[PDB]
Symmetry: D2
Subunit: 244 residues, 4 copies
């Protein structure tokens, strides 16, 4: 049980890496606490909890209230998984909307920074913790016509080494996983997986020649939450089949 007795809070669990991460963390023995904007609704909480028995859906959805509630459940949080996702909008220079660029930055850089400000103080008092940004490999290569999206992922990735330095003396590590080409609801959803021509083009440009599994991304994030990853910090770990 690699995460035996670790309390992991995963944000926006209905998006991006939430399910993979919940699934693996539970299989590795974690206590999982999950936030989602939908979790003010009992039926959404019930559906998550019935799919992932042992995971707890938090009924507070706003940041400060959600953290206070997460902390009340067991008294502490061992790892924060900041699972943040805004749509990658096709946005050539000539059509890109500045308001969408600001919204991408809000979701992918300002919001996870806020959550870190809320959770970090409890970790410091413990002298232990893990903060994992679930992010994108895209800034490592760049993507024509998606520069606002890539730039906002870069802003996210660009918190990591500074926060690592700032929290490292309290033994808390800070890392990101730079995902790409992983089956997920935000970027590689089922409709895309069923487009044979899209898939042929995509997999021809990945060294492993396939898309990644949400369980692979989950296992990566889980590994960075574990005790065994305690000497890794400040890092953005590419998880894109060799594409970066």
């Amino acid at each position: 049980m690699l995460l035996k007795d670790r309390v992991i809070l995963i944000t926006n669990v209905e998006k991006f890496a939430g399910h993979g991460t919940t699934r693996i963390a539970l299989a590795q023995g974690a206590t999982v606490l999950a936030h989602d904007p939908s979790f003010d609704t009992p039926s959404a909480r019930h559906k998550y909890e019935s799919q992932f028995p042992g995971a707890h859906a938090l009924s507070a959805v706003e940041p400060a209230a959600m953290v206070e509630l997460a902390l009340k459940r067991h008294g502490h949080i061992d790892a924060l998984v900041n699972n943040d996702a805004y749509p990658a909008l096709k946005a050539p220079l000539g059509e890109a909307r500045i308001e969408d660029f600001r919204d991408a930055l809000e979701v992918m850089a300002v919001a996870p920074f806020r959550l870190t400000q809320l959770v970090a103080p409890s970790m410091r008092k413990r002298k232990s913790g893990r903060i994992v940004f679930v992010s994108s490999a895209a800034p490592l290569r760049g993507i024509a016509n998606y520069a606002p999206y890539v730039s906002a992922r870069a802003a996210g990735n660009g918190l990591v080494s500074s926060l690592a330095k700032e929290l490292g003396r309290d033994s808390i590590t800070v890392n990101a996983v730079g995902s790409n080409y992983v089956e997920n609801p935000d970027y590689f959803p089922p409709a895309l997986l069923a487009n044979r021509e899209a898939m042929a083009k995509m997999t021809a440009q990945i060294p492993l020649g396939r898309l990644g599994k949400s369980d692979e991304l989950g296992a990566t994030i889980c590994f960075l939450c574990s005790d065994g990853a305690g000497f890794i910090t400040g890092h953005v770990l590419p998880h894109a089949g060799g594409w970066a």
Copy 2:
């Protein structure tokens, strides 16, 4: 004359790398057009122009009007130097203000993206151009207690490879210079240079053992504007004495 007959537009010329860049571009034969928020004022225009004879201070200060005016002067712009600077505020997690994080992103990522959207179309029609972001090396190492600043510089740097891809078929290059420890009014001003103890600590952590000259940063930016740098694109060039 490495920039003989090149029209270079430098933004926010009273900040950061503006003066170094003006000075070297003129010495290398360029026609320099300069924007600054102060340039709605005749005396500010007159002071710039008297310090840098041959440089033209543009009297429009808002982006769209400033670009239209810059373009009217000679009919074209060969290089855009996006010279963007917001204060690096000491901002530990516990004190950082979210509104300052948003403002940093506005100044250092959204504003230069906007300016690029305004200038790029004229270059495309020419099939030639240069876009240089004047940015920071800080994201290459990270800085404790300045993560909002570093993250916003990372967002800036994170436009570069995506825009390079998007504009490369029209032969326009897109690069950034990742400055640090360069004498300049924003980050390394005279007051700091006169603090002997600050300077001893700073230069002990730079491999070249000294701060950089605004003429060195200017010469770097000028080089990326030149014809000889036409096969360099998508790159963030560290200019920090070996610190990154």
Copy 3:
């Protein structure tokens, strides 16, 4: 059991990351096969096997014979851990010996390439495998007066993305772990750990403020050997407490 039923071959097991890796791999359920130049001697084999019950010390020490023997034991190898270490000799330009530079390259780049050439064909036929170079973070920052050492580690790291591409279609991943400041017999041995002044200087320059454990390096390597790391390839994972 994250490595349940995986056959892991670890080279030069008496050096560098061998013991940490053996220890964690066994705790995670692996079958461990170990090479060492000392293992032509029965007593050395007996000492390893008594310290790590369930690990098998191979009695062939030369590459081709050692691989043929490793493969005979169970019929296959799921992961190769190329655990390679040559001394980091203090070698300023003026004193560096060219023959030592060649020897460093032999040990840290040519030898692991050879071992990969020997093991890879068996993996290809299976369409599964893992190759992990145990390497150094030093090339990510550079070190004055040790450039031959750093350069040879860079050569090692510089196999990874090319081999990843070459073997990725057969689903085999290729990665490196860029260690530094990890308690180990080659670079951070007990004598160094007992030098209070050395330790104070070292830990002042690591963000986590401490040296890493051989179990942390072992757990990292084990993670890259696991099924859960199947979408990570071509990567050099820094494992140096934030130092890179």
Copy 4:
């Protein structure tokens, strides 16, 4: 004249970036001294000198003698351009010859290190200098079936930040230019340029959609030799049309 009164020594001038660099350095006012293995022959010296009037072909071909002679010509060397090239042999794991891997490392890492050991002491005494490795972008992406070549270029690149640190206090900078897809006799020769199908495949994978000019590589190297690049050190500058 950006390199007015600078003495530049370019090695192996008949290969790779030699001609581009000679041509631009002379146009920018440099005094060029050139080494080549062919320059023990008067007619080869005469042919270089007649093609590049003002450049001096050195008649000593072995390292120590060649340096002593270069230094005698004017008393000093302001910049060393280590222009090193060994063939990129197609070498899948199953066919790669270990002796060719060693030879690649000899030519691309050990030889330029040797030349640096020979030239550096004269610079230190002056407190000024420039060392530029002419290298490859290939390690920044990796190339299937060429891993020995890529690895040896990585070893080369892997000298740069360590030597930069070691020589930076004497104000000497050390950088590399990571070329790829530049017309040159070693890697992109005329025969390749005339293969329409090869060229279509190559340029489809470069963001600028074309090969680079030997004058562009030369201008890059010249820029790093100049006074204006005095705050750049420890860097590997990609020069590959956006490919890295």
